Design a protein around this ligand. Structure first.
Ligand code: ATP
Ligand code: ADP
Ligand code: MG
Ligand code: MG
Lengths: 177, 365, 141, 277, 210, 70, 105, 52, 70, 52
């Protein structure tokens, strides 16, 4: 049931009647969004558009053919037309593929959507590629993390996040192929 | 006793005394002949006594204009009905040699002094440019063999002007309500001939060149015009308090004038942007269309009563008209006519989109 | 803020229509209000010297002083604008000689030379017409 | 006399130098803080591609944020946002609801605590003091989910160009309160997505709308900072041309008073010498 | 007596009465100002002698606007009664449209921003400005001036771009048939019989550009 | 107030006014000290906004009418 | 400057040529005539220049013209005092100038 | 200007000069603190315009 | 430096100074046009901060004590 | 304050024309070839109008 249809078209009339007529109607982030979810397209075969995102940088916006993402239930590959999903991610390696060649960014968390028009959206807070990490620091940081376990369970939640991320990173650096 | 002229900036901020000397200070093209013709139009009709016009060193075109506009007004009657005329013209205009312009104000004063002393009447003495008296004495004193004083004037400036101006008085047996125009020589109020005649006036109405460059007519400076009638013991506290409030708002806007220039209005305080908007309103509300200016503007004249101005200027001060635009106040008579102009500005922004006027089948009409 | 003293010369300086005459008048009216209260020798006798002003203003001022009762202690020297320039030049000295009687006889005087900027213009008129060489703003030396 | 207009000319001349320096300081600050704005523009659109854009919802408790600037030479920006803030705040208030108004930047607290002081619970300043980062926006968003509103209206200036700064309103719905319900049509529009997370969808949507509030708040203050620098770059340009027109007028007035002074002093000397010669 | 020097000279430019032949004398004194300063001694002398003024601005003159008439500061209130009728009909809305055009001066998008609803008065006051430009040594008859400003201010040149209104108004004068100029000069006003044929003539001309 | 001086200062005024007027003369100097810093609205630490009303109340205290000395 | 005008006026009126005349600092011509008229006891006009400033300049600048036999063209270095173009000596000199060549640093 | 700030004696520290202000006369230790006070006062006099 | 002229100029200076001072007056002029930015906290693009520190050490280079010519 | 890269192509075409216009205003003089070697040019008005 959708008898109360909020939206950019349906904010405009209540604004034009209530707000003063000197002002132009305020913009919306939907006006700056060119591609959407429900309206189909964007696949045209074996390609599908991958938008890999961080708050500080836009890591990829090209089209790919498979991406493997570290979900909470383990890794999973997204082919050209996956089922629509909202997959929470755990610390692991996001791997893009455009064909024979691949780029592997290690991520810290985040989510990953793929939409009913086949466009996928990987939304993480910090993604550093495996060249940028040195393995001598993650071993000592996990040693300092898996040692001190305070009884204040906020800090043990932070410790669990630490040992999860550092352990998946350590397994992510001997996993060269 | 007050003399209501029907001009908003004159009634509110510097009201005219009914038997006192009145000066209109102006700077060559700011409007002190149009203001004095409007004072003749508004005052000399409702006055029951006699009028004298001393034209001292002004245009002869204006002398013929005043003569013809007084004949068609019936104020001057020619021939057999001459006894019913109410006005005496004395003309020493700017084509005359300087000995004539330096003594024609004394002729106009003598005609007014007869009606004051002998006839016991109330007289109006309009002098167009009492400055040209001073200037004509300055022209003839260069050849009288005197050492000149400051800017180039005669050493006897103040005693000449004082011996002329001390004769224009309300005595115990008659009153002369004299309105004099004073010309400031290079828009200079510190020139010795305006600065000397500031002292002999009860009400000075100083007209400004920059106010006229804004388009606000009459171009009366509200913070340079003064009166001895602006006093609560003569006009009452309700008029005095709204006059001093309007002057306070206009000065508090003048103190912001360079910050608004070099920074813009974007950064001012919201208790001062209110002050700037209210003062931009009450300095358009001092603008007024004249009955004598309707021939070269086309907008008809507006006589505003005094109580209308006091109530209309209380309303902009308290905030009862903060929603009306600034230009709704420009060149209207009353605060009522602001309201019929504010909404007429909002029809005409909506009447753009109503019709597509085409004219058919008139080639056979 | 600027307290006067009893033998002090305090200048009231300002532009036109700012209230200089008003400050002087409130001084004279307040001296009437305090003269009816002090024992006979702290009483201040005022002199108003009205140089160059118009005769109507002096009439208004005499009317005000006599309706407030301040004219009992006030002398008014009035060399108005129609008077000859030596009378306007000499009226501060006439008024000071009138008010020096109270200074010399143990009483207390107070004098207002209203428009002392006009005594100098009358002196300049006299000195330029006596053909003395002018100076700054053609004032005498 | 003729010394006051000389030092006034000097004052206006140095003010013109100061504002011409501040103009290109703001130009450099806009040129470097533009790439960060375009980089942060990417992450806001997967959520509006997923959750959509629902400004005209009926909520009962709503937090409205006006993203303003800190320094006060922006030239018509923070006043524009406090206009649009109450213009959309009166548009969506007709239900007898609760409203918390928050400002980012203390020029918002100087402008909002006099226009809605009944509803103003939070003032957040010093945000641009070094740079805006995502953890900072995350802490601000956690202070916003300290209250438990049903919606979040975010008011900011989108850096459209170096001259145009479109003021936008971005809306975030609370998960269990309106997010599942404003997607209901013929079932639900979110049921096409297969949730691959740990717990149930009432926590996935909680994490997603907290993330979405933080992301749009990061992009809000980042876009608003770039438009604040770009409008200061134009306001200081108008200030230099105003203090140049004022200098060009006051120099002519000084030259007139200079010539008048030399003429009147020489006329005084000649008048004093002709009385003796 | 440098005032009297000019006053006794300019007062001789009179319109005599009907007893004195009815002759007249028009004067155009010329006063050169220094840096646009009209608060000079001689300039304020002659301003307070002559009836109107024709202020010519150096800013407009070095912006190509020639004749560079400051339309706000220039007045002539004595010859306003003695205007060509028809020109008086259209010159009212001409200078009112230019009057509200002068309210869009230096803040179209120069000053702070743009509202862009007054683009109509902006792109109308520009066409009224370049309508009034005129080259040297070629004075226009009054019946061809009032037709040109009728075509300007009734909206008959509203579609033309700003760059060729100089060509548009001379195309209006050369293409509209020269009977209407004789009707307008002999009648001396835009009669109700004449605005119809004028508006019928003004739609059937090819204005350049666009 | 800044430009009007007096040579005698004290020793020639009311002693009771001398107790209560030095704290007015210096406080109006503090009030004039902040008037060139009231065009922006930063309102530093409830000092440059507190005397901005305290001195403004003192200058309103010093106003009086005409022909009515106290 | 009148001596230079005479040597140019020979080449104009007799030889029938197109002559240049370089008056280096027409301002110093004006200034020298101001000094001369101050020494003859005359009352200075506006700011301190000679009363005859316009006619002393016009005595020079009106012999520089094109006649039926030749012409004299004149490139005059102009000094502007106190950076003031409305100073009456450059304001008078600019009334006679038919062109302007500004050399910039 | 110094006296309008209530600072008495209202000596302009910059515009005052002496022949004794020489490091050979009053000593270099006195001279350098005098020149340092004048340096910081001239720098503040130049900074007041951008402060306002 | 900007208002001091010598119309003889470089034709009558030290030829070893003439090839060093021609840089000096040029970068002093560059420092004089960028003179407001010295009082700023926001550093600019380091083609102006370079000339700012350079012109500052050059003005401190030309200082000289009295009665000790070089 | 911004840079030549953000300019329009017609706001770089005016730069590319104006730089060679102000280079084409230069001229080697005949009175400087005594000590600068490059011979001097006398340009006619007809060459100047067409070349600009
Ligand atoms: N304390 C006051 N409160 C209100 N109004 C005042 C006060 N003092 C003076 N005025 C008004 O100011 C006007 C000018 O006052 P006053 O004549 O004393 O000034 P003035 O400088 O002597 O003027 P002038 O130079 O014309 O003689 C008077 O009309 C008076 O009513
Ligand atoms: N009240 C007014 N309304 C409209 N225009 C005015 C008004 N007063 C003056 N003007 C304009 O200013 C000019 C000044 O005319 P006038 O009064 O003769 O000047 P002066 O002050 O030199 O006598 C008039 O031509 C008129 O166009
Ligand atoms: Mg007149
Ligand atoms: Mg007085």
């Amino acid at each position: 049931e959708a008898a109360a249809p909020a939206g950019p078209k349906e904010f405009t009339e209540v604004w034009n009647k209530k707000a003063p007529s000197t002002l132009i109607v305020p913009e919306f982030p939907s006006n700056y969004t060119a591609v959407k979810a429900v309206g189909e397209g964007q696949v045209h075969g074996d390609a599908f558009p991958v938008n890999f995102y961080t708050p500080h940088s836009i890591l990829s916006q090209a089209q790919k053919d498979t991406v493997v993402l570290p979900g909470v239930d383990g890794y999973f590959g997204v082919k050209a037309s996956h089922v629509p999903t909202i997959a929470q991610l755990k610390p692991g390696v996001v791997e893009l593929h455009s064909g024979a060649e691949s780029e592997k960014f290690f991520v810290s968390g985040g989510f990953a959507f793929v939409h009913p028009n086949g466009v996928t959206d990987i939304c993480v807070l910090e993604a550093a590629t495996l060249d940028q990490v040195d393995p001598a620091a993650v071993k000592s940081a996990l040693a300092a993390a898996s040692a001190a376990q305070p009884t204040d369970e906020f800090e043990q939640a932070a410790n669990r996040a630490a040992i999860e991320l550092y352990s998946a990173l350590e397994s992510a650096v001997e996993a060269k192929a | 006793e007050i003399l209501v002229t029907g001009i908003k900036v004159v009634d509110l901020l510097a009201p005219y005394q009914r038997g006192g000397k009145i000066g209109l200070f102006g700077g060559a093209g700011v409007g002190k002949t149009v203001l004095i013709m409007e004072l003749i139009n508004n005052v000399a009709k409702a006055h029951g006594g006699f009028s004298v016009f001393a034209g001292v060193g002004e245009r002869t075109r204006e002398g013929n204009d005043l003569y013809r506009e007084m004949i068609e007004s019936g104020v001057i009657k020619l021939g057999a009905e001459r006894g019913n005329s109410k006005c005496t013209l004395v003309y020493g205009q700017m084509n005359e040699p300087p000995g004539a312009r330096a003594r024609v104000a004394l002729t106009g004063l003598t005609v007014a002094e007869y009606f004051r002393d002998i006839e016991g009447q109330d007289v109006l003495l309009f002098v167009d440019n009492i400055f040209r008296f001073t200037q004509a004495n300055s022209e003839v004193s260069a050849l009288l063999g005197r050492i000149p004083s400051a800017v180039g004037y005669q050493p006897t400036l103040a005693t000449d002007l004082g011996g002329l101006q001390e004769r224009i008085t309300t005595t115990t047996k008659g009153s002369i309500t004299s309105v004099q125009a004073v010309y400031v020589p290079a828009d200079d109020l510190t020139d010795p001939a305006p600065a000397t005649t500031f002292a002999h006036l009860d009400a000075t109405t100083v007209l400004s060149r920059s106010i006229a460059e804004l388009g606000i007519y009459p171009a009366v400076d509200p913070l340079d015009s003064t009166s001895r009638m602006l006093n609560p013991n003569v006009i009452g506290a309700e008029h005095y308090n709204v006059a001093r409030g309007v002057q306070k708002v206009l000065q508090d806007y003048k103190n912001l004038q360079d910050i608004i220039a070099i920074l813009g209005m974007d950064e001012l305080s919201e208790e001062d942007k209110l002050t700037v908007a209210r003062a931009r309103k009450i300095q358009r509300f001092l603008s007024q269309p004249f009955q004598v200016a309707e021939v070269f503007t086309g907008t008809p004249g507006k006589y505003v009563d005094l109580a209308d101005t006091i109530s209309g200027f209380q309303g902009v001060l308290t905030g009862k008209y903060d929603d009306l635009p600034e230009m709704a106040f420009y060149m209207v008579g009353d605060i009522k006519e602001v309201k019929e102009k504010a909404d007429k500005m909002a029809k005409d922004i909506a009447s753009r989109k109503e019709a597509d006027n085409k004219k058919v089948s008139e080639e056979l009409k | 803020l600027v307290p006067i003293g009893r033998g002090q010369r305090e200048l009231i300086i300002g532009d036109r229509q700012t209230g200089k005459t008003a400050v002087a008048i409130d001084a004279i009216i307040h001296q009437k209000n305090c003269n009816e209260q002090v024992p006979k020798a702290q009483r201040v006798y005022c002199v108003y010297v009205a140089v160059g002003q118009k005769r109507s203003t002096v009439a208004q001022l005499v009317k005000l002083f006599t309706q407030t009762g301040a004219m009992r202690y006030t002398i008014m020297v009035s060399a108005t604008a129609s008077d000859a320039a030596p009378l306007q030049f000499l009226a501060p000295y006439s008024g000071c000689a009138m008010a020096e009687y109270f200074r010399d006889t143990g009483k207390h005087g107070l004098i207002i030379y209203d428009d002392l900027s006009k005594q100098s213009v009358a002196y300049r008129q006299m000195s330029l017409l006596l053909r003395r060489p002018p100076g700054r703003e053609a004032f005498p030396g | 006399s003729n010394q006051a207009v000389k030092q006034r000319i000097r004052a206006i001349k140095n003010i013109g130098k100061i504002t011409k320096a501040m103009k290109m300081v703001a130009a450099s600050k806009m040129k470097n803080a533009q790439i960060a704005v375009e980089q942060s523009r990417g992450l806001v659109d997967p959520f509006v591609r997923l959750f959509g854009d629902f400004p005209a919802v009926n909520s009962n408790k709503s937090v409205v944020v006006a993203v303003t600037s800190d320094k006060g030479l922006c030239g018509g920006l923070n006043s524009n946002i406090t206009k649009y803030t109450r213009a959309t705040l009166a548009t969506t208030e007709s239900e007898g609801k609760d409203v918390v108004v928050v400002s980012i930047g203390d020029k918002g607290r100087s402008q909002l605590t006099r226009i809605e002081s009944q509803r103003y619970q939070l003032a957040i300043a010093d945000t641009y003091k070094v740079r805006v980062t995502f953890g900072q926006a995350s802490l601000i968003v956690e202070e916003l989910i300290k209250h438990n509103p049903q919606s979040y209206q975010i008011l900011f200036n989108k850096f459209r160009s170096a001259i145009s700064f479109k003021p936008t309103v971005a809306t975030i719905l609370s998960p269990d309160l309106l997010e599942k319900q404003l997607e209901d049509v013929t079932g639900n529009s979110l049921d096409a997505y297969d949730i691959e997370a740990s717990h149930e969808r009432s926590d996935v949507l909680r994490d997603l709308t907290e993330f979405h509030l933080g992301v749009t708040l990061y992009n809000a203050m980042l876009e608003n900072n770039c438009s604040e620098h770009a409008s200061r770059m134009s306001a200081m340009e108008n200030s230099t041309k105003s203090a140049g027109e004022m200098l060009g007028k006051l120099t002519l007035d000084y030259n007139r008073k200079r010539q008048a002074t030399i003429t009147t002093e020489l006329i005084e000397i000649i008048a004093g010498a002709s009385a003796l010669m | 007596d440098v005032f009297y020097l000019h006053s006794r000279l300019l007062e001789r430019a009179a319109k005599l009465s009907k007893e004195l032949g009815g002759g007249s004398l028009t004067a155009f004194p010329v006063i050169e100002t220094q840096a646009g300063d009209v608060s000079a001694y001689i300039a304020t002398n002659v301003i307070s002698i002559t009836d109107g003024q024709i202020f010519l601005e150096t800013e407009l003159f070095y912006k190509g606007i020639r004749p560079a008439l400051n339309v706000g500061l220039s007045v002539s209130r004595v010859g306003s009664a003695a205007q060509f009728p028809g020109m008086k009909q259209v010159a009212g809305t001409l200078k009112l449209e230019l009057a509200q055009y002068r309210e869009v001066a230096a803040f179209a998008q120069f000053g702070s921003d743009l509202d862009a609803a007054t683009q109509y008065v902006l792109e109308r006051g520009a066409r009224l400005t370049e309508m009034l430009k005129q080259k040297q040594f070629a004075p226009i008859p009054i019946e061809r001036q009032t037709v040109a400003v009728y075509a300007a201010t009734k909206g008959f040149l509203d579609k033309v771009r700003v760059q060729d209104i100089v060509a548009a108004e001379e195309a209006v004068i050369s293409q509209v048939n020269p009977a209407v100029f004789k009707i307008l000069k002999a009648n001396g006003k835009i009669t109700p019989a004449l605005d119809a044929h004028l508006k019928a003539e003004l739609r059937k001309v090819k204005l350049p550009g666009a």
